[PDB]
Amino acid sequence: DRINTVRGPITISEAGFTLTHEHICGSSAGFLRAWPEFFGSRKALAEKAVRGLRRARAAGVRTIVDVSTFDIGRDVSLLAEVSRAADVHIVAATGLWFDPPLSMRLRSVEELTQFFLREIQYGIEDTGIRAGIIKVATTGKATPFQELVLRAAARASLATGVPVTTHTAASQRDGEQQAAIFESEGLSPSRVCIGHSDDTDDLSYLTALAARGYLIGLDQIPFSAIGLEDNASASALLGNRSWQTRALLIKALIDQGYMKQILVSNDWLFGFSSYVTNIMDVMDRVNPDGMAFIPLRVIPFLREKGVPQETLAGITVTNPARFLSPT
Amino acid sequence: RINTVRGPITISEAGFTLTHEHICGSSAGFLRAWPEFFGSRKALAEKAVRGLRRARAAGVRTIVDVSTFDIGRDVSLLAEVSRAADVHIVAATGLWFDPPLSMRLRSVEELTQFFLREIQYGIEDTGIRAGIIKVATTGKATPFQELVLRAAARASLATGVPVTTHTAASQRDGEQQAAIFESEGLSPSRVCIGHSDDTDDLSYLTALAARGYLIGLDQIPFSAISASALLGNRSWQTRALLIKALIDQGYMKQILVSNDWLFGFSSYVTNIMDVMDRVNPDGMAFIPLRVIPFLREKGVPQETLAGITVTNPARFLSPT
Numbered sequence: 338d339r340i341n342t343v344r345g346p347i348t349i350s351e352a353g354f355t356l357t358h359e360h361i362c363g364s365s366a367g368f369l370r371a372w373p374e375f376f377g378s379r380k381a382l383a384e385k386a387v388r389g390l391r392r393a394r395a396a397g398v399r400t401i402v403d404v405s406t407f408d409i410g411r412d413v414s415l416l417a418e419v420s421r422a423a424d425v426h427i428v429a430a431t432g433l434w435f436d437p438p439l440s441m442r443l444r445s446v447e448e449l450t451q452f453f454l455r456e457i458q459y460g461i462e463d464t465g466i467r468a469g470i471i472k473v474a475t476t477g478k479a480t481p482f483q484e485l486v487l488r489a490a491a492r493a494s495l496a497t498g499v500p501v502t503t504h505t506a507a508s509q510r511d512g513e514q515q516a517a518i519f520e521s522e523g524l525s526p527s528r529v530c531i532g533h534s535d536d537t538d539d540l541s542y543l544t545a546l547a548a549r550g551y552l553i554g555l556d557q558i559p560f561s562a563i564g565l566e567d568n569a570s571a572s573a574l575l576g577n578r579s580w581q582t583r584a585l586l587i588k589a590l591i592d593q594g595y596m597k598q599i600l601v602s603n604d605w606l607f608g609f610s611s612y613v614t615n616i617m618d619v620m621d622r623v624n625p626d627g628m629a630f631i632p633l634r635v636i637p638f639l640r641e642k643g644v645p646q647e648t649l650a651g652i653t654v655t656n657p658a659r660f661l662s663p664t
Numbered sequence: 665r666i667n668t669v670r671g672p673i674t675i676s677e678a679g680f681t682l683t684h685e686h687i688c689g690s691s692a693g694f695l696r697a698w699p700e701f702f703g704s705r706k707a708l709a710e711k712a713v714r715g716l717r718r719a720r721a722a723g724v725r726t727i728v729d730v731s732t733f734d735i736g737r738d739v740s741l742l743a744e745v746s747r748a749a750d751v752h753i754v755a756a757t758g759l760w761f762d763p764p765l766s767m768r769l770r771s772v773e774e775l776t777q778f779f780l781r782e783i784q785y786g787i788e789d790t791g792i793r794a795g796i797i798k799v800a801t802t803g804k805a806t807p808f809q810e811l812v813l814r815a816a817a818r819a820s821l822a823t824g825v826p827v828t829t830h831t832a833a834s835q836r837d838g839e840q841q842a843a844i845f846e847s848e849g850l851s852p853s854r855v856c857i858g859h860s861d862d863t864d865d866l867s868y869l870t871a872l873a874a875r876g877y878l879i880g881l882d883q884i885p886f887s888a889i890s891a892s893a894l895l896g897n898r899s900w901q902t903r904a905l906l907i908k909a910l911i912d913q914g915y916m917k918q919i920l921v922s923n924d925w926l927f928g929f930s931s932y933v934t935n936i937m938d939v940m941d942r943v944n945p946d947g948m949a950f951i952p953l954r955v956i957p958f959l960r961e962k963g964v965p966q967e968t969l970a971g972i973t974v975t976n977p978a979r980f981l982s983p984t
């Protein structure tokens with residue numbers, strides 16, 4: 338019944354409309370502290386984040402799950418500052434993404450389990466802020482290290498009850514390998530979200546995972562590089578599929594009877610240093626609504642297509658609550 | 665004046681200086697996210713204070729911590745241990761072998777601005793300014809490594825702060841690094857070609873010293889007679905004899921000596937710090953306790969050894 342946020346423990350009824358895969362800043366370990374001028378200043382980034390979260394709140398958002406791990410440069414102090422200023426609950430993450438430094442990548446599965454447990458049970462750094470989710474990743478076939486991370490995440494989830502969420506290359510069907518590794522450790526599918534799943538039109542892959550009890554992360558809805566095909570960097574990140582196509586997968590999974598397995602988000606950020614220089618400016622031009630894209634543009638889109646309000650409320654409120662609750 | 669973690673110091677205050685050392689070899693943000701890996705931050709700090717105090721009692725007055733952003737440099741820890749041990753510590757900027765995505769995707773102009781920020785403004789929100797730029801290559805330089813060496817040269821040219829390198833001495837890296845630094849217009853007197861004691865080729869070292877380069881004979885205690893691939897198969901005496909060999913060639917003023925020691929090591933296998941502590945119990949005190957008396961026994965005078973340990977580092981670190 339209680340989940341950990343950057344402001345402390347809250348009850349699941351307080352969570353409300355929740356965006357399950359978001360970021361305040363997409364960076365690297367220690368980067369924001371060492372070079373805040375990359376984002377203008379730390380103050381400029383904080384103010385931009387507060388404006389965006391306040392706009393999201395006005396649109397209906399009550400909670401966002403910041404899936405930024407240590408290697409994505411998660412700065413919990415920044416998350417706490419912006420959460421309080423915008424009055425939007427933010428759930429922090431532990432885990433490891435695809436840029437682990439030497440001190441992380443040379444560790445055993447036992448050592449990684451203890452790190453994840455430290456961030457969930459004790460706290461992140463010296464802040465006392467506890468992680469409420471574990472973020473892991475693969476991009477195609479898992480490397481020997483990525484396999485250890487998935488196993489460590491599963492062991493950390495089994496000891497705490499906190500969920501696991503993933504980054505995938507949906508086109509390569511990564512969810513199947515991830516799922517197999519999680520189950521080999523005894524982890525329940527109901528504790529896992531196979532993210533970036535809206536990057537494929539293969540409904541057979543999505544429904545099969547949904548049938549096993551997995552939560553499906555249709556989390557990059559505003560990602561579209563239509564209009565900017567001359568920009569190779571933006572095209573590789575955002576893709577050539579429209580927001581409408583990504584959004585119709587929510588309808589397709591409801592129509593197949595898997596409304597309870599759907600998690601929706603924007604995968605948005607206010608700062609982005611782990612990619613090419615002016616990517617944040619390009620992204621803000623594509624989607625000016627930012628994190629508010631789901632309640633403002635996606636929810637009314639699905640309403641006119643025939644999806645009931647109680648099903649949409651069930652996806653945005655009930656599903657994240659069941660997912661985030663420690664069991 | 666040379667910038668330290670406790671503020672500016674004059675050239676005369678530097679004294680006996682170890683030019684390539686580390687308080688902790690880690691990764692960006694690692695020490696603050698998982699201090700329990702080292703026992704605790706308090707335990708690491710206490711071990712560092714004892715090791716620096718031991719080096720101080722052996723004659724050392726200043727150490728240059730060449731730990732970069734990606735080696736997990738924590739300047740606030742460096743400042744704490746420096747105060748407690750009464751040893752000056754010069755912090756570093758630059759990039760090593762483990763840059764994260766936010767660093768490795770940057771242009772030469774952006775990396776120059778980062779290095780400049782750490783030298784001119786300060787490191788993080790501490791106000792502590794770097795007094796040396798650390799860079800690295802393993803064999804033939806990768807496209808990104810070339811960008812870093814160029815950004816390092818440009819940061820040095822705008823500030824007067826020196827550049828120190830990590831090399832794969834067996835693959836003759838110093839020659840390529842030298843060509844890149846020179847193409848940028850950087851004076852050889854502002855560059856130290858480090859890890860140069862890992863080779864038996866004297867002709868390579870003398871040729872670089874003739875061009876005006878400072879030779880970093882900095883891994884003297886490294887001997888393994890995963891632990892064998894890091895320390896090497898050669899003895900400390902063989903590495904120490906290279907100092908004498910370069911003095912005999914008339915390049916006394918071009919030599920910089922150090923230990924390349926640390927008190928915490930997380931960027932390698934789990935129990936490597938314990939393995940390293942058995943091999944060399946002297947730690948950072950290895951140079952004044954074992955290397956200097958060894959050289960005095962081989963016929964090297966005191967004024968020459970004082971020239972290598974006091975005069976050369978002071979001239980190298982002094983912003984020119």
Ligand SMILES: [Co+2]
Pocket residue numbers: 504505533
């Ligand atoms: Co992702």
Ligand SMILES: [Co+2]
Pocket residue numbers: 358359360404604
């Ligand atoms: Co994301």
Ligand SMILES: [Co+2]
Pocket residue numbers: 830831859
């Ligand atoms: Co080195």
Ligand SMILES: [Co+2]
Pocket residue numbers: 684685686730924
């Ligand atoms: Co070193």
